[PDB]
Design an enzyme around this catalytic site. Structure first.
Site, PDB file in Angstrom:
ATOM      1  N   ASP A 121     137.030  16.258  62.323  1.00 38.61           N
ATOM      2  CA  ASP A 121     137.207  16.007  60.656  1.00 38.61           C
ATOM      3  C   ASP A 121     136.903  16.814  59.542  1.00 38.61           C
ATOM      4  OD1 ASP A 121     138.153  14.363  58.572  1.00 38.61           O
ATOM      5  OD2 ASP A 121     136.250  12.698  59.050  1.00 38.61           O
TER       6      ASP A 121
ATOM      7  N   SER B 186     148.048  22.562  45.565  1.00 40.61           N
ATOM      8  CA  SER B 186     149.644  22.763  45.903  1.00 40.61           C
ATOM      9  C   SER B 186     150.368  22.834  44.780  1.00 40.61           C
ATOM     10  CB  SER B 186     150.178  21.335  46.894  1.00 40.61           C
ATOM     11  OG  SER B 186     151.531  21.733  46.940  1.00 40.61           O
TER      12      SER B 186
END
Length: 330
Positions: free
Chosen positions: A35, A199
């Site tokens: 994770d 992004s």
């Protein structure tokens, strides 16, 4: 040193991935959920409330000659999905794919929430976010990666998640045969303890690319792709019959649909998520309403590039002094 381990989907939907981890001496092998959105290595154990264990493999510290109680240390964590767990702490030898750390904090669960109990395939979590998020008190502990880092050939790990198929986590090296083209690296902020990056935009299907900054986290422990409501609405608007259902808890679409791809930007580079990756199947057995793999982050407080996004790429988690993230097509 290096390590290389195969990671395997827990079910036919790729709801999560499990990676075998050797703990203790002799080794006890547990299948952990790696994770990159948390920083605790915790396991089902001989100390876990019996009624809360249902099929998981447990760690038994008393059977490990290298286990030592970390005196006074406790831990308690709650995840973004509302699940939680807590307990005490041992140090022990932990190996992943041939890479061994001695003195690793292994957080033994005394309690786990129902979500964990109900998932027989996940024996615990191995956190790979920054150690500043580790919940051990009163002495915060380091992640497996942080402990391994100085010994690694290069201070990196990579995630290569499969679509409906096994993939690989590598530690300490970049497998240049595992991706196509070049790796594009992008800046990381560690201010919130996550692999947080920005992004450069998105496209829906064969549509034009929209240049827009989307801050979010690279999170292998989250199944879906969670993005701003504007972006998600633009995606689902291209699927006939798709709608946001408050009763189901997100966007659903007719199972008869063909889903468009979704592209996200990494610098000037582009990662394409095929439409099939966005299908999470019937909302309930036999339903013709299917659950979408791209969902709104509104009310989460952060955008999350979960498995839906990451499995479309070869992803480098660069833990150099100034960390960065790399993405390549594959």
């Amino acid at each position: 040193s290096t390590g290389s381990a195969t990671t395997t989907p827990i079910d036919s939907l790729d709801d999560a991935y499990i990676t075998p981890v050797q703990i203790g001496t002799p080794a006890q092998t547990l299948n952990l959920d790696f994770d990159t959105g948390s920083s605790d290595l915790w396991v089902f154990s001989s100390e876990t409330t019996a009624s809360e264990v249902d099929g998981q493999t447990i760690y038994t510290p008393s059977k490990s000659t290298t286990a030592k109680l970390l005196s006074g240390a406790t831990w308690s964590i709650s995840y973004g999905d509302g699940s939680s767990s807590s307990g005490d702490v041992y140090t022990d030898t932990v190996s992943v794919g041939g890479l061994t750390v001695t003195g690793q904090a292994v957080e033994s669960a005394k309690k786990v929430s129902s979500s964990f109990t109900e998932d027989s395939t996940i024996d615990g979590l191995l956190g790979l976010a920054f150690s500043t998020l580790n919940t051990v008190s009163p002495t915060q502990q380091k992640t497996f990666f942080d402990n391994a880092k100085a010994s690694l050939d290069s201070p990196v790990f990579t995630a290569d998640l499969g679509y409906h198929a096994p993939g690989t986590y590598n530690f300490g090296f970049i497998d240049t045969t595992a991706y196509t083209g070049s790796i594009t690296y992008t800046a990381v902020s560690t201010k919130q303890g996550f692999w947080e990056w920005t992004s450069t935009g998105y496209a829906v299907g064969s549509g034009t690319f929209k240049s827009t900054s989307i801050d979010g986290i690279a999170d292998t422990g989250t199944t879906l792709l969670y993005l701003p409501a504007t972006v998600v609405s633009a995606y689902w608007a291209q699927v006939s019959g798709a709608k946001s259902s408050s009763s189901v808890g997100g966007y659903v679409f007719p199972c008869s649909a063909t889903l468009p791809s979704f592209t996200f930007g990494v610098g000037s580079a582009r990662i394409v998520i095929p439409g099939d990756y966005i299908d999470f199947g019937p909302i309930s057995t036999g339903s013709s309403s299917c659950f979408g793999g791209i969902q709104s982050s509104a009310g989460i407080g952060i955008n999350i590039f979960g498995d839906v996004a990451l499995k479309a790429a070869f992803v480098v988690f660069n833990g150099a002094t100034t960390p960065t993230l790399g993405f390549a097509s594959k």
